[PDB]
From a paper:
The nuclear import receptor Karyopherin β2 (Kapβ2, also known as Transportin-1 or TNPO1) imports FUS into the nucleus, where it functions in DNA repair, transcriptional regulation, mRNA and miRNA processing, and in RNA shuttling and stabilization. Kapβ2 imports WT FUS by binding tightly to the FUSPY-NLS (residues 501–526), with a dissociation constant (KD) of ~ 50 nM. However, mutations related to the PY-NLS of FUS (FUSPY-NLS) cause the FUS variants to localize to different extents to the cytoplasm and cause different degrees of disease severity in patients.
Although the FUSPY-NLS peptide carrying the P525L mutation binds Kapβ2 weaker than the WT FUSPY-NLS, it still binds Kapβ2 with substantial affinity (KD 180 nM), which allowed assembly of the Kapβ2·FUS(P525L)PY-NLS complex for structure determination by X-ray crystallography. We solved the crystal structure of the FUS(P525L)PY-NLS in complex with Kapβ2 (dissociation constant, KD = 180 nM) to 2.7 Å resolution, by molecular replacement. Residues 507–526 of the bound FUS(P525L)PY-NLS peptide were modeled. The FUS(P525L)PY-NLS-bound Kapβ2 is almost identical to WT FUSPY-NLS-bound Kapβ2 (root-mean square deviations or rmsd of 0.5 Å for 784 aligned Cα atoms). Epitope-1 (residues 508–511) and epitope-2 (residues 514–522) of FUS(P525L)PY-NLS bind Kapβ2 almost exactly the same as WT PY-NLS. Structural differences are observed only in epitope-3 (residues 525 and 526) where the ALS mutation resides. The P525L mutation changes the structure of the PY-NLS main chain from residues 522–525, which diverged from the peptide main chain of the WT PY-NLS and moved slightly farther away from Kapβ2. The L525 side chain of FUS(P525L)PY-NLS makes fewer contacts with Kapβ2 W460 and I457, and is too far away to interact with the L419 side chain of Kapβ2. There is no observed electron density for the E523 and R524 side chains of FUS(P525L)PY-NLS even though these side chains have well-defined electron density in the Kapβ2-bound WT FUSPY-NLS structure where E523 contacts the karyopherin and R524 participates in intra-peptide interactions. In summary, the P525L mutation caused local structural changes that resulted in fewer contacts with Kapβ2 and in the loss of potentially stabilizing intra-peptide interactions, all contributing to a significant loss of affinity for the importin.
Numbering used by the authors:
A (entry chain B): 507 to 526
B (entry chain A): 5 to 320, 371 to 890
Amino acid sequence: GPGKMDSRGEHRQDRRERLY
Amino acid sequence: WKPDEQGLQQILQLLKESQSPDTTIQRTVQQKLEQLNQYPDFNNYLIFVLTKLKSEDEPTRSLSGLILKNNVKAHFQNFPNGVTDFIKSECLNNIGDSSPLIRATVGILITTIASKGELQNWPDLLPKLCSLLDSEDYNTCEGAFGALQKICEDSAEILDSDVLDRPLNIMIPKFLQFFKHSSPKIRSHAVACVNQFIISRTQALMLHIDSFIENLFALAGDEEPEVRKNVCRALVMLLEVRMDRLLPHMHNIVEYMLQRTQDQDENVALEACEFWLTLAEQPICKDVLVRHLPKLIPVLVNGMKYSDIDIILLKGSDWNLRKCSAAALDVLANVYRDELLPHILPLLKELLFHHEWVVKESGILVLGAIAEGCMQGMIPYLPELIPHLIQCLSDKKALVRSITCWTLSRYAHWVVSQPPDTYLKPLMTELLKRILDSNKRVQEAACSAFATLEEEACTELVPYLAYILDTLVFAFSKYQHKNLLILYDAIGTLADSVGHHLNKPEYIQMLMPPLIQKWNMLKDEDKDLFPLLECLSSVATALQSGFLPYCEPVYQRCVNLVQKTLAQAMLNNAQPDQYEAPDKDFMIVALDLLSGLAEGLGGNIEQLVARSNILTLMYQCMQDKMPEVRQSSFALLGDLTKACFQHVKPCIADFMPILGTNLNPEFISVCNNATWAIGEISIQMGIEMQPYIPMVLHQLVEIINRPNTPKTLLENTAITIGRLGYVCPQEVAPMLQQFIRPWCTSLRNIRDNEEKDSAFRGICTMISVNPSGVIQDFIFFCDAVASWINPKDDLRDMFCKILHGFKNQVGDENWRRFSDQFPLPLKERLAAFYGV
């Protein structure tokens, strides 16, 4: 929505372990 | 050169002593070499012992060569040319020594000199190496090829350039002559060399591609693993860049690759399996596999079992066959969608319930991999599979539990969309139980999966907040380092999901102490701050006033981290060779937490900012080369504009031309945050904003008229244009009809909140100043006004005045004919509020 756009969700997904 | 008896005796003695089993003798021989290493004459002795002194045994000559190698990789700049050239000569003259250990050391030396030194400093290495390739003695040609292979591997992008003068145009056509070579080793070298230049589309290769492909096919029948492996990786790379040349042979190639994927030599099979991954990205995929898909699916599924070695290792890992197969199945599911399900359901039936845990585990993995591609087709089966997976969460094999966590998380959307009591509730309950599993891999699987579920569920996880926290805090006590970081991410996502509901004294009291504890135990240089800090960022936004007792130390540390980073880059920029550049993530995360503090605390951040140099630092971040730094600093700028503008106002005249230069849609989140910031500064500046409009308006109108620009950027752009119009209708008013269409389209879809209110005020004042700007596209404005559910009364009468005003110019006749085109909800809504 209107407001800031942060990358915290994406950083959190980048450290989720990768199965493959 | 000059070998002396005394010198040789001393160094030979020292080399013997370095091979002593005694630990004290080792440390003192090591410090003696520490001292000797800087003296070039010593290096002359080292190579001399390697290549010339046959009397000495092989491990001594080779150890001399290797010590020399370390000296090169650490002091080669300080070598004078006479010694360097003596080493270079002696190496190339011994490239084919009948001792394998000596040959290997000479080889490592050679490659190290080309690496550490300079390819253009040894102008005649490559030409000579190539001619050595033609030599008679086998070992000589093997050694030269070994060297070239290594050079092409690390110097890849340097022979495909004008640094030298196209050595590839000589090397590549010469390698392709050796694919037919009688010895397996040399064939391998030849192919592995050429392979380095496929994705680069290297001219020398591209204009010989026909001969290349031909020689590759000639090799297909080869049973030597190293050559099969290299042919396989040839075809895989070729598929990505020279597709055209391969189509006419595609059937035989797929047949070959499908055969190799099933090779019992795992290493061959892995390179083969890459074929399916990259093939699934080409648009011609469906057409090419029509004859083979039925076999391809079971072969992939079968390769997705843990290997026997991994089973044993995990009993008490990087790319492998299993990971490649799973990735290939994932992408193929996205290509084929529901068409894959008849291939896949019979395998799943036999795998998901199997009595052998390895087989069951692979089945659950398969079920997860295909989730994205096949979601629609799998819905009918989920009422059975989901309860079954939930049961598997308490399987007695840890590896089954963990994969189940992940697969369930892949179906989280469906779970959330069903009645909470049927799937969500029991899933969450068992997920929480898993989080406290005694197995560390299960713990992390459960935490990731719970986070994914949290993201999807949002508000639906407000009634089960205390129990969630009950479990997450307890994990603090049981988790080790590696898993506490994932826990911080899970807390972060919880705070984002439940927002202000987290603000209760009991929750704050159980959550904050262990977060601060680990904050105090980690140093400013520890990367593990990123998840803790980002977690705190989310918690702060959620806690608001509740965060007051904790902010001061957090604020202070964050500003300092920004400061020391910025200071690091400066110092590195001055003397790059003595001061390593900093990791800017410390700065991004520190800014993001400050953003959260300012959003959370609002006005209550004033005291801290009053005592700080945050804006002086912020000015430097906004000008950084790295997009994410700018994106974070513009976000902080907008938050501080709202919270305590008095400290920001002095900087506007400097900040605005920089905000004006970051309205570039290539960087979505930078452009977005700049735009938002400019709207927020607008509201505080009022008419004082007039001089700044020209630096931003032209760009904002272009951005709002740009096709395929994310919804969120367009909403913020619209709001900001509205806000600029509210404080300065005359400067912006005039362009009304170039933006009104997309402005209305975008803003009609957002919730009734403060930003929307403010922006509509702007569009109303502007209509009063340039009403003809609206006449042509009034349908859009009518729709935008109809989008308001509960407008504050002054905004409503503004609306009614413009609507009533419009009907009185085109007349009851054009009005009725115009409003006939109103969908029913619209016509009724505006008679309900505005009586039009």
